[PDB]
Coordinates of N, CA, C and O and ligand atoms in Angstrom, one line a residue:
Chain A
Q1300 N 0.8 -1.2 0.0 CA 0.0 0.0 0.0 C 0.9 1.3 0.0 O 2.1 1.2 0.3
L1301 N 0.2 2.4 -0.3 CA 0.9 3.7 -0.3 C 1.2 4.1 1.2 O 0.3 4.1 2.0
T1302 N 2.5 4.4 1.5 CA 2.9 4.7 2.8 C 3.1 6.3 3.0 O 3.0 7.0 2.0
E1303 N 3.3 6.7 4.2 CA 3.5 8.1 4.4 C 4.8 8.7 3.8 O 4.8 9.7 3.2
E1304 N 5.9 7.9 3.9 CA 7.1 8.3 3.3 C 7.1 8.3 1.7 O 7.7 9.1 1.1
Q1305 N 6.3 7.4 1.2 CA 6.1 7.3 -0.3 C 5.3 8.6 -0.7 O 5.6 9.1 -1.8
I1306 N 4.4 9.0 0.1 CA 3.6 10.2 -0.1 C 4.5 11.4 -0.1 O 4.4 12.3 -1.0
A1307 N 5.4 11.5 0.8 CA 6.4 12.6 0.9 C 7.4 12.5 -0.3 O 7.8 13.6 -0.7
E1308 N 7.7 11.3 -0.7 CA 8.5 11.2 -1.9 C 7.8 11.8 -3.1 O 8.4 12.5 -3.9
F1309 N 6.5 11.5 -3.3 CA 5.7 12.0 -4.4 C 5.6 13.5 -4.2 O 5.5 14.2 -5.2
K1310 N 5.5 14.0 -3.0 CA 5.3 15.4 -2.7 C 6.6 16.2 -3.2 O 6.5 17.3 -3.7
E1311 N 7.8 15.6 -2.9 CA 9.0 16.1 -3.4 C 9.0 16.2 -4.9 O 9.5 17.2 -5.5
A1312 N 8.5 15.1 -5.5 CA 8.5 15.1 -7.0 C 7.6 16.2 -7.6 O 7.9 16.8 -8.6
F1313 N 6.4 16.3 -6.9 CA 5.5 17.4 -7.3 C 6.2 18.8 -7.3 O 6.0 19.6 -8.2
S1314 N 6.9 19.0 -6.2 CA 7.7 20.3 -6.1 C 8.7 20.5 -7.2 O 9.0 21.6 -7.5
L1315 N 9.2 19.4 -7.8 CA 10.1 19.5 -8.9 C 9.5 20.1 -10.1 O 10.0 20.9 -10.8
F1316 N 8.2 19.7 -10.4 CA 7.4 20.2 -11.5 C 6.8 21.6 -11.2 O 6.8 22.4 -12.0
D1317 N 6.4 21.7 -9.9 CA 5.7 23.0 -9.5 C 6.8 24.1 -9.2 O 7.1 24.3 -8.0
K1318 N 7.3 24.7 -10.3 CA 8.4 25.7 -10.1 C 8.1 26.8 -9.2 O 8.9 27.2 -8.3
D1319 N 6.9 27.5 -9.4 CA 6.6 28.6 -8.7 C 5.9 28.3 -7.3 O 5.7 29.2 -6.5
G1320 N 5.7 27.0 -7.1 CA 5.2 26.5 -5.8 C 3.8 26.9 -5.5 O 3.4 27.0 -4.3
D1321 N 3.0 27.2 -6.5 CA 1.7 27.7 -6.3 C 0.7 26.5 -6.1 O -0.5 26.7 -6.0
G1322 N 1.2 25.3 -6.1 CA 0.4 24.1 -5.8 C -0.2 23.4 -7.0 O -1.0 22.5 -6.9
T1323 N 0.1 23.9 -8.2 CA -0.4 23.3 -9.5 C 0.7 23.2 -10.5 O 1.6 24.1 -10.6
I1324 N 0.7 22.2 -11.3 CA 1.6 22.1 -12.5 C 0.8 22.5 -13.8 O -0.2 21.9 -14.1
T1325 N 1.4 23.5 -14.4 CA 0.8 24.0 -15.7 C 1.5 23.3 -16.9 O 2.5 22.6 -16.7
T1326 N 1.0 23.6 -18.1 CA 1.6 23.1 -19.3 C 3.0 23.7 -19.4 O 3.9 23.1 -20.0
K1327 N 3.2 25.0 -19.0 CA 4.4 25.7 -19.1 C 5.5 25.1 -18.2 O 6.6 24.9 -18.7
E1328 N 5.1 24.7 -17.0 CA 6.1 24.1 -16.1 C 6.4 22.6 -16.6 O 7.6 22.2 -16.4
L1329 N 5.5 21.9 -17.1 CA 5.7 20.6 -17.6 C 6.7 20.7 -18.8 O 7.6 19.9 -18.9
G1330 N 6.5 21.7 -19.7 CA 7.3 21.9 -20.8 C 8.7 22.2 -20.4 O 9.7 21.8 -21.0
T1331 N 8.8 23.0 -19.3 CA 10.1 23.4 -18.7 C 10.9 22.2 -18.2 O 12.1 22.1 -18.5
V1332 N 10.2 21.3 -17.5 CA 10.9 20.1 -17.0 C 11.3 19.2 -18.2 O 12.5 18.7 -18.1
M1333 N 10.5 19.0 -19.2 CA 10.8 18.2 -20.3 C 12.0 18.7 -21.1 O 12.9 17.9 -21.4
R1334 N 12.1 20.0 -21.3 CA 13.2 20.6 -22.1 C 14.5 20.4 -21.3 O 15.6 20.3 -21.9
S1335 N 14.4 20.4 -19.9 CA 15.6 20.3 -19.1 C 16.1 18.9 -19.2 O 17.3 18.6 -18.8
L1336 N 15.3 17.9 -19.6 CA 15.7 16.5 -19.8 C 16.0 16.3 -21.3 O 16.3 15.2 -21.7
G1337 N 16.0 17.4 -22.1 CA 16.4 17.3 -23.5 C 15.3 16.9 -24.5 O 15.6 16.5 -25.6
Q1338 N 14.1 17.0 -24.0 CA 12.9 16.6 -24.9 C 12.3 17.9 -25.4 O 12.3 18.9 -24.7
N1339 N 11.7 17.8 -26.6 CA 11.0 19.0 -27.2 C 9.6 18.8 -27.5 O 9.2 18.6 -28.7
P1340 N 8.7 18.8 -26.5 CA 7.2 18.6 -26.8 C 6.6 19.9 -27.4 O 7.2 21.0 -27.2
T1341 N 5.5 19.7 -28.1 CA 4.8 20.9 -28.6 C 3.7 21.3 -27.6 O 3.5 20.7 -26.6
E1342 N 3.1 22.5 -27.9 CA 2.1 23.0 -27.0 C 0.9 22.1 -27.0 O 0.3 21.9 -25.9
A1343 N 0.6 21.4 -28.1 CA -0.6 20.5 -28.2 C -0.3 19.3 -27.4 O -1.3 18.7 -26.8
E1344 N 0.9 18.8 -27.4 CA 1.2 17.6 -26.7 C 1.2 17.8 -25.2 O 0.8 16.9 -24.4
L1345 N 1.7 19.0 -24.7 CA 1.6 19.3 -23.3 C 0.2 19.4 -22.8 O -0.1 19.0 -21.7
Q1346 N -0.7 20.0 -23.6 CA -2.1 20.1 -23.3 C -2.7 18.8 -23.2 O -3.6 18.5 -22.3
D1347 N -2.4 17.9 -24.1 CA -3.0 16.5 -24.1 C -2.5 15.7 -22.9 O -3.2 15.0 -22.3
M1348 N -1.2 15.9 -22.6 CA -0.6 15.2 -21.4 C -1.4 15.6 -20.1 O -1.7 14.7 -19.3
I1349 N -1.6 16.9 -20.0 CA -2.3 17.4 -18.8 C -3.8 17.0 -18.8 O -4.3 16.6 -17.7
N1350 N -4.4 17.1 -19.9 CA -5.8 16.7 -20.1 C -6.1 15.2 -19.6 O -7.1 14.9 -19.1
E1351 N -5.1 14.4 -19.9 CA -5.1 13.0 -19.5 C -5.3 12.7 -18.0 O -5.9 11.7 -17.6
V1352 N -4.7 13.6 -17.2 CA -4.6 13.4 -15.8 C -5.3 14.5 -15.0 O -5.5 14.4 -13.8
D1353 N -5.8 15.6 -15.7 CA -6.5 16.7 -15.1 C -8.0 16.2 -14.8 O -8.9 16.5 -15.5
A1354 N -8.1 15.5 -13.6 CA -9.4 14.9 -13.3 C -10.6 15.9 -13.1 O -11.7 15.5 -13.4
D1355 N -10.3 17.1 -12.7 CA -11.4 18.1 -12.5 C -11.5 19.0 -13.7 O -12.4 19.9 -13.7
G1356 N -10.7 18.8 -14.7 CA -10.8 19.5 -16.0 C -10.5 21.0 -16.0 O -11.0 21.7 -16.8
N1357 N -9.7 21.4 -15.0 CA -9.5 22.8 -14.8 C -8.2 23.3 -15.5 O -7.9 24.5 -15.4
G1358 N -7.5 22.4 -16.2 CA -6.4 22.8 -17.0 C -5.0 22.7 -16.4 O -4.0 22.8 -17.0
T1359 N -5.0 22.4 -15.1 CA -3.7 22.2 -14.3 C -3.8 20.9 -13.5 O -4.8 20.4 -13.2
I1360 N -2.6 20.5 -13.0 CA -2.5 19.4 -12.2 C -2.1 19.8 -10.7 O -1.1 20.4 -10.5
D1361 N -3.0 19.5 -9.8 CA -2.7 19.7 -8.4 C -2.1 18.4 -7.8 O -2.0 17.4 -8.4
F1362 N -1.7 18.4 -6.5 CA -1.1 17.3 -5.9 C -1.9 16.0 -5.9 O -1.4 14.9 -6.1
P1363 N -3.2 16.1 -5.5 CA -4.0 14.8 -5.5 C -4.0 14.2 -6.9 O -4.0 12.9 -7.0
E1364 N -4.2 15.0 -8.0 CA -4.1 14.5 -9.3 C -2.8 13.9 -9.7 O -2.7 12.8 -10.3
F1365 N -1.7 14.6 -9.3 CA -0.3 14.1 -9.5 C -0.1 12.8 -8.8 O 0.5 11.8 -9.4
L1366 N -0.5 12.7 -7.5 CA -0.4 11.5 -6.7 C -1.1 10.4 -7.3 O -0.7 9.2 -7.3
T1367 N -2.4 10.6 -7.8 CA -3.2 9.6 -8.3 C -2.6 9.0 -9.6 O -2.4 7.8 -9.6
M1368 N -2.2 9.8 -10.5 CA -1.7 9.3 -11.8 C -0.3 8.7 -11.7 O 0.0 7.7 -12.4
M1369 N 0.5 9.2 -10.8 CA 1.9 8.7 -10.6 C 1.8 7.3 -10.0 O 2.6 6.4 -10.4
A1370 N 1.0 7.2 -8.9 CA 0.9 5.9 -8.3 C 0.3 4.8 -9.2 O 0.7 3.6 -9.2
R1371 N -0.6 5.2 -10.1 CA -1.2 4.3 -11.1 C -0.1 4.0 -12.1 O 0.1 2.8 -12.5
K1372 N 0.7 4.9 -12.6 CA 1.7 4.7 -13.6 C 2.8 3.8 -13.1 O 3.4 3.0 -13.9
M1373 N 3.1 3.8 -11.8 CA 4.1 3.0 -11.2 C 3.7 1.5 -11.3 O 4.6 0.6 -11.2
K1374 N 2.4 1.2 -11.4 CA 1.9 -0.1 -11.5 C 2.0 -0.7 -12.9 O 1.6 -1.9 -13.1
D1375 N 2.5 0.1 -13.8 CA 2.7 -0.4 -15.2 C 4.2 -0.3 -15.6 O 5.0 0.4 -15.0
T1376 N 4.5 -1.1 -16.5 CA 5.9 -1.1 -17.1 C 5.8 -0.6 -18.5 O 5.0 -1.0 -19.3
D1377 N 6.6 0.4 -18.8 CA 6.6 1.0 -20.1 C 7.4 0.2 -21.1 O 8.2 -0.7 -20.8
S1378 N 7.2 0.5 -22.4 CA 7.9 -0.2 -23.5 C 9.4 -0.1 -23.4 O 9.9 0.8 -22.7
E1379 N 10.1 -0.9 -24.1 CA 11.6 -0.9 -24.0 C 12.2 0.3 -24.6 O 13.2 0.8 -24.1
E1380 N 11.6 0.8 -25.7 CA 12.1 2.0 -26.3 C 11.9 3.3 -25.4 O 12.7 4.1 -25.4
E1381 N 10.8 3.3 -24.7 CA 10.5 4.4 -23.8 C 11.5 4.4 -22.6 O 12.0 5.4 -22.2
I1382 N 11.8 3.2 -22.1 CA 12.8 3.0 -21.0 C 14.2 3.3 -21.5 O 15.0 4.0 -20.9
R1383 N 14.5 2.8 -22.7 CA 15.8 3.0 -23.3 C 16.1 4.5 -23.6 O 17.2 5.0 -23.4
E1384 N 15.1 5.2 -24.0 CA 15.2 6.7 -24.2 C 15.4 7.4 -22.8 O 16.3 8.3 -22.8
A1385 N 14.8 7.0 -21.8 CA 15.0 7.6 -20.5 C 16.4 7.3 -20.0 O 17.0 8.2 -19.3
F1386 N 16.9 6.1 -20.2 CA 18.2 5.7 -19.8 C 19.3 6.6 -20.5 O 20.3 7.0 -19.8
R1387 N 19.1 7.0 -21.7 CA 20.0 7.8 -22.4 C 20.1 9.3 -21.9 O 21.1 10.0 -22.0
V1388 N 19.0 9.7 -21.3 CA 18.9 11.0 -20.7 C 19.9 11.1 -19.5 O 20.6 12.1 -19.3
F1389 N 20.1 10.0 -18.8 CA 21.0 9.9 -17.7 C 22.4 9.5 -18.1 O 23.4 10.1 -17.7
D1390 N 22.5 8.5 -19.0 CA 23.8 8.0 -19.5 C 24.3 8.9 -20.6 O 24.3 8.5 -21.8
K1391 N 24.8 10.1 -20.2 CA 25.3 11.1 -21.1 C 26.5 10.7 -22.0 O 26.5 10.9 -23.2
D1392 N 27.5 10.1 -21.4 CA 28.6 9.6 -22.1 C 28.4 8.4 -22.9 O 29.2 7.9 -23.7
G1393 N 27.2 7.8 -22.7 CA 26.7 6.6 -23.4 C 27.5 5.3 -23.2 O 27.5 4.4 -24.1
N1394 N 28.2 5.2 -22.1 CA 29.0 4.1 -21.8 C 28.2 2.9 -21.3 O 28.8 1.8 -21.0
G1395 N 26.9 3.0 -21.1 CA 26.1 2.0 -20.6 C 25.9 1.9 -19.1 O 25.3 1.0 -18.6
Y1396 N 26.5 2.9 -18.4 CA 26.4 2.9 -16.9 C 26.1 4.3 -16.4 O 26.8 5.3 -16.8
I1397 N 25.1 4.4 -15.6 CA 24.7 5.7 -14.9 C 25.6 5.8 -13.7 O 25.4 5.0 -12.7
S1398 N 26.4 6.8 -13.6 CA 27.3 7.1 -12.5 C 26.6 8.1 -11.5 O 25.5 8.7 -11.9
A1399 N 27.1 8.3 -10.4 CA 26.6 9.3 -9.4 C 26.7 10.7 -10.0 O 25.7 11.5 -9.9
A1400 N 27.8 11.0 -10.7 CA 28.0 12.3 -11.3 C 26.9 12.6 -12.4 O 26.5 13.7 -12.6
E1401 N 26.6 11.6 -13.2 CA 25.6 11.7 -14.3 C 24.2 12.0 -13.7 O 23.4 12.7 -14.2
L1402 N 23.9 11.3 -12.6 CA 22.7 11.5 -11.9 C 22.6 12.9 -11.2 O 21.6 13.6 -11.3
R1403 N 23.8 13.3 -10.6 CA 23.9 14.7 -10.1 C 23.6 15.7 -11.2 O 22.9 16.7 -11.0
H1404 N 24.1 15.4 -12.4 CA 24.0 16.4 -13.5 C 22.5 16.6 -13.9 O 22.1 17.7 -14.2
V1405 N 21.8 15.5 -14.0 CA 20.4 15.5 -14.4 C 19.5 16.2 -13.4 O 18.7 17.1 -13.7
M1406 N 19.7 15.8 -12.1 CA 19.0 16.4 -11.0 C 19.3 17.9 -10.9 O 18.4 18.7 -10.5
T1407 N 20.5 18.3 -11.1 CA 20.9 19.8 -11.1 C 20.2 20.5 -12.2 O 19.7 21.6 -12.0
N1408 N 20.1 19.9 -13.4 CA 19.5 20.5 -14.6 C 18.0 20.7 -14.3 O 17.4 21.6 -14.8
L1409 N 17.4 19.8 -13.5 CA 16.0 19.8 -13.1 C 15.8 20.9 -12.0 O 14.6 21.2 -11.6
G1410 N 16.8 21.5 -11.6 CA 16.7 22.6 -10.6 C 16.8 22.1 -9.2 O 16.7 22.9 -8.2
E1411 N 16.9 20.8 -9.0 CA 17.0 20.2 -7.7 C 18.4 20.4 -7.1 O 19.4 20.3 -7.9
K1412 N 18.5 20.6 -5.8 CA 19.8 20.8 -5.2 C 20.2 19.7 -4.2 O 20.1 20.0 -3.0
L1413 N 20.6 18.6 -4.7 CA 20.9 17.4 -3.8 C 22.3 17.5 -3.3 O 23.2 18.1 -3.9
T1414 N 22.6 16.8 -2.1 CA 23.9 16.6 -1.6 C 24.5 15.4 -2.3 O 23.8 14.6 -2.9
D1415 N 25.8 15.2 -2.2 CA 26.5 14.0 -2.7 C 26.0 12.8 -2.0 O 26.0 11.7 -2.6
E1416 N 25.7 12.9 -0.7 CA 25.2 11.8 0.0 C 23.8 11.4 -0.5 O 23.5 10.2 -0.5
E1417 N 22.9 12.3 -0.8 CA 21.6 12.0 -1.3 C 21.6 11.3 -2.6 O 20.8 10.5 -2.9
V1418 N 22.6 11.7 -3.5 CA 22.7 11.1 -4.8 C 23.2 9.7 -4.7 O 22.7 8.8 -5.4
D1419 N 24.2 9.5 -3.9 CA 24.8 8.2 -3.6 C 23.7 7.2 -3.1 O 23.7 6.0 -3.4
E1420 N 22.9 7.8 -2.2 CA 21.7 7.0 -1.7 C 20.8 6.5 -2.8 O 20.3 5.4 -2.8
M1421 N 20.6 7.4 -3.8 CA 19.7 7.1 -4.9 C 20.4 6.0 -5.8 O 19.7 5.0 -6.1
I1422 N 21.7 6.1 -6.1 CA 22.4 5.2 -6.9 C 22.4 3.8 -6.1 O 22.2 2.8 -6.8
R1423 N 22.6 3.8 -4.8 CA 22.7 2.6 -4.0 C 21.4 1.8 -4.1 O 21.5 0.6 -4.2
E1424 N 20.3 2.5 -4.1 CA 19.0 1.8 -4.1 C 18.7 1.2 -5.4 O 18.1 0.1 -5.5
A1425 N 19.1 1.8 -6.5 CA 18.9 1.4 -7.9 C 19.9 0.3 -8.3 O 19.7 -0.6 -9.1
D1426 N 21.1 0.4 -7.7 CA 22.2 -0.6 -7.9 C 21.8 -2.0 -7.4 O 21.3 -2.1 -6.3
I1427 N 22.0 -3.0 -8.3 CA 21.7 -4.4 -7.9 C 23.0 -5.2 -7.7 O 23.1 -5.9 -6.7
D1428 N 23.9 -5.2 -8.6 CA 25.1 -6.0 -8.5 C 26.1 -5.4 -7.6 O 27.1 -6.1 -7.2
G1429 N 26.0 -4.2 -7.2 CA 26.8 -3.6 -6.2 C 28.1 -2.9 -6.7 O 29.0 -2.7 -5.9
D1430 N 28.1 -2.6 -8.0 CA 29.3 -2.0 -8.5 C 29.3 -0.5 -8.4 O 30.3 0.2 -8.8
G1431 N 28.3 0.1 -7.8 CA 28.2 1.5 -7.5 C 27.7 2.3 -8.7 O 27.8 3.6 -8.7
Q1432 N 27.2 1.6 -9.8 CA 26.6 2.3 -10.9 C 25.3 1.6 -11.3 O 25.0 0.5 -10.8
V1433 N 24.6 2.2 -12.2 CA 23.3 1.6 -12.7 C 23.4 1.3 -14.1 O 23.5 2.2 -15.0
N1434 N 23.4 0.0 -14.5 CA 23.4 -0.4 -15.9 C 22.0 -0.4 -16.4 O 21.0 -0.2 -15.7
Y1435 N 21.8 -0.7 -17.7 CA 20.5 -0.7 -18.3 C 19.6 -1.7 -17.7 O 18.4 -1.5 -17.5
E1436 N 20.1 -2.9 -17.5 CA 19.4 -4.0 -16.9 C 18.8 -3.7 -15.5 O 17.7 -4.0 -15.2
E1437 N 19.6 -3.0 -14.7 CA 19.2 -2.5 -13.4 C 18.1 -1.4 -13.5 O 17.2 -1.3 -12.7
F1438 N 18.4 -0.5 -14.5 CA 17.5 0.6 -14.8 C 16.1 0.1 -15.2 O 15.0 0.6 -14.8
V1439 N 16.1 -1.0 -16.0 CA 14.8 -1.7 -16.4 C 14.1 -2.2 -15.2 O 12.9 -2.1 -15.1
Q1440 N 14.8 -2.9 -14.3 CA 14.2 -3.5 -13.1 C 13.6 -2.4 -12.2 O 12.5 -2.6 -11.7
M1441 N 14.3 -1.3 -12.1 CA 13.8 -0.2 -11.3 C 12.5 0.3 -11.8 O 11.6 0.7 -11.0
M1442 N 12.3 0.4 -13.1 CA 11.1 0.9 -13.7 C 10.1 -0.2 -14.0 O 9.0 0.1 -14.6
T1443 N 10.3 -1.4 -13.4 CA 9.4 -2.5 -13.7 C 8.4 -2.7 -12.5 O 8.8 -2.7 -11.3
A1444 N 7.1 -2.8 -12.8 CA 6.1 -2.9 -11.8 C 6.3 -4.2 -11.0 O 6.6 -5.3 -11.5
Chain B
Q720 N 14.3 4.7 0.9 CA 14.3 5.3 -0.5 C 13.6 4.4 -1.5 O 14.1 3.3 -1.8
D721 N 12.5 4.8 -2.0 CA 11.8 4.1 -3.1 C 11.9 4.8 -4.4 O 11.3 4.4 -5.4
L722 N 12.8 5.7 -4.5 CA 13.2 6.4 -5.8 C 12.1 7.0 -6.5 O 12.2 7.2 -7.7
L723 N 11.0 7.3 -5.8 CA 9.8 7.8 -6.5 C 9.9 9.1 -7.2 O 9.2 9.5 -8.1
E724 N 10.9 9.9 -6.7 CA 11.3 11.2 -7.3 C 11.9 10.9 -8.7 O 11.5 11.5 -9.7
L725 N 12.9 10.0 -8.7 CA 13.6 9.6 -9.9 C 12.6 8.9 -10.8 O 12.7 9.2 -12.1
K726 N 11.8 8.1 -10.3 CA 10.9 7.3 -11.1 C 9.8 8.2 -11.8 O 9.4 7.9 -12.9
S727 N 9.4 9.3 -11.1 CA 8.4 10.2 -11.6 C 8.9 10.9 -12.9 O 8.1 11.1 -13.8
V728 N 10.2 11.3 -12.9 CA 10.7 12.1 -14.1 C 10.9 11.1 -15.2 O 10.8 11.5 -16.4
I729 N 11.3 9.9 -14.9 CA 11.4 8.8 -16.0 C 10.1 8.5 -16.6 O 10.0 8.3 -17.8
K730 N 9.0 8.5 -15.8 CA 7.7 8.2 -16.3 C 7.2 9.2 -17.3 O 6.3 9.0 -18.1
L731 N 7.8 10.4 -17.3 CA 7.5 11.5 -18.2 C 7.6 11.1 -19.7 O 6.8 11.4 -20.5
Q732 N 8.7 10.3 -20.0 CA 9.0 9.9 -21.3 C 7.8 9.2 -22.0 O 7.3 9.6 -23.0
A733 N 7.3 8.1 -21.3 CA 6.2 7.4 -21.9 C 4.9 8.1 -21.8 O 4.0 8.0 -22.7
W734 N 4.8 9.0 -20.8 CA 3.6 9.9 -20.7 C 3.5 10.8 -21.9 O 2.4 10.9 -22.5
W735 N 4.6 11.4 -22.3 CA 4.7 12.3 -23.4 C 4.5 11.5 -24.7 O 3.8 12.0 -25.6
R736 N 5.2 10.4 -24.9 CA 5.2 9.6 -26.1 C 3.7 9.2 -26.4 O 3.4 9.2 -27.6
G737 N 2.9 9.0 -25.4 CA 1.5 8.6 -25.7 C 0.6 9.7 -26.3 O -0.5 9.4 -26.6
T738 N 1.2 10.9 -26.4 CA 0.4 12.0 -26.9 C 0.9 12.6 -28.2 O 0.3 13.5 -28.8
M739 N 2.1 12.1 -28.6 CA 2.8 12.7 -29.7 C 2.0 12.7 -31.0 O 1.4 11.7 -31.3
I740 N 2.1 13.7 -31.8 CA 1.6 13.8 -33.2 C 2.7 14.2 -34.1 O 3.5 15.1 -33.8
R741 N 2.9 13.4 -35.2 CA 4.0 13.7 -36.1 C 3.7 15.0 -36.8 O 2.6 15.3 -37.3
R742 N 4.8 15.8 -37.0 CA 4.7 17.1 -37.7 C 4.5 16.8 -39.2 O 3.7 17.4 -39.8
Ligands
CA1661 CA1 2.9 26.0 -10.5
CA1662 CA1 -6.8 19.8 -12.0
CA1663 CA1 27.7 6.8 -18.3
CA1664 CA1 25.2 -1.9 -10.9

């Protein structure tokens, strides 16, 4: 079941998207996050993304809506191409391994300000074989329902 | 740590892909 700490984790994630902290994610903020990950969505695609999860139809995503759709999405596994694309966002040098520094780099680009300890903690949890890095196979497991 | 912050941004890719229209 959903725990308190998991809720706080999702709340942290919501704050990543909610740049101005006004309690809602707009198409503008979603576009901002996507571009910082190197993706180039259109205005129409951003509207459609939000429409899919905007339960009250008001044009923006609040925390309950964010929590609802994210918890649902975690119960699904995305296609290999979708996962492989996400992996390349992190594996910048393309060597097949996500290092702490590469994770630091993405999180920084997202505007988040993590400590070296916090990043290592993330790597450690995703790491399976214990080499201190995340390969594609481990990345796939992490994203697997 | 359940990596839900990291997992949330990764979920964006498939979320976006599902709405794409070719130019
Ligand atoms: Ca906002
Ligand atoms: Ca809404
Ligand atoms: Ca790498
Ligand atoms: Ca590993």
